[PDB]
Design a binder for this molecule. Structure first.
Ligand code: 1OD
Ligand code: CL
Ligand code: FE
Length: 174
């Protein structure tokens, strides 16, 4: 319970001209980074997928699907469009005990192969942040991964706080 501090928002770019319609669909967490994320060579992190669906009201219904304990687990929540396109906050924050704040900023994407998204939440008074490298496929070029590593580090994260989940087939195909 000691955390590297969330970076200031000025160190987190925002994708220009955000096309919310084009960001829809399944993305693969190809890379994971944040102040509560730890590399664990004993029990390495399995890849998971996060599906974004625009509703009529242009909120995202966001569903993450994870292979856990031999089953598929579904983490569902809503992203509400925020201050500027590419930026979001969390709907029904009341239903999450201890949660007082939640921010999403799409750092970059080209929509049809890769994306970088930054998350910042304050739960139980602790400030957590993470960056996810999203891939439309389960594998990305070494260039894009090093860019993920580089950017993670520009925000204070050491290497043991940067993770590339191992590709799996169960649950996240479909
Ligand atoms: C079944 C689990 O899978 C997920 C999950 C699955 C895919 C992507 C996510 O962002 C997820 O949170 N959440 C579930 C979960 O119970 N936890 C532990 C509970 C603490 N989380 C929360 O209180 C929470 C509340 C509202 C929205 C969220 O995204 C939240 O994480 C999650 C604890 C792990 N969280 C983090 O490492 C984290 C770190 C920084 C920022 C975040 O938004 C984070 O979720
Ligand atoms: Cl803790
Ligand atoms: Fe979360």
């Amino acid at each position: 319970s000691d955390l590297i501090p969330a970076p200031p928002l000025s160190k987190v770019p925002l994708q220009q001209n955000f096309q919310d319609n084009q960001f829809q669909g399944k993305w693969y967490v190809v890379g994971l980074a944040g102040n509560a994320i730890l590399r664990e060579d004993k029990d390495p992190q399995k890849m998971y997928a996060t599906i974004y669906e625009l509703k009529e009201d242009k909120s995202y219904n966001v569903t993450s699907v994870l292979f856990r304990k031999k089953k598929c687990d579904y983490w569902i929540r809503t992203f509400v469009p925020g201050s500027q396109p590419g930026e979001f906050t969390l709907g029904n924050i009341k239903s999450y005990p201890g949660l007082t704040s939640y921010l999403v900023r799409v750092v970059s994407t080209n929509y049809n192969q890769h994306a970088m998204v930054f998350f910042k939440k304050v739960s139980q008074n602790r400030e957590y942040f993470k960056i996810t490298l999203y891939g439309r496929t389960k594998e990305l070029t070494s260039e894009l991964k090093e860019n993920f590593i580089r950017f993670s580090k520009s925000l204070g994260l050491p290497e043991n706080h940067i993770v590339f989940p191992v590709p799996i087939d169960q649950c996240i195909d479909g």
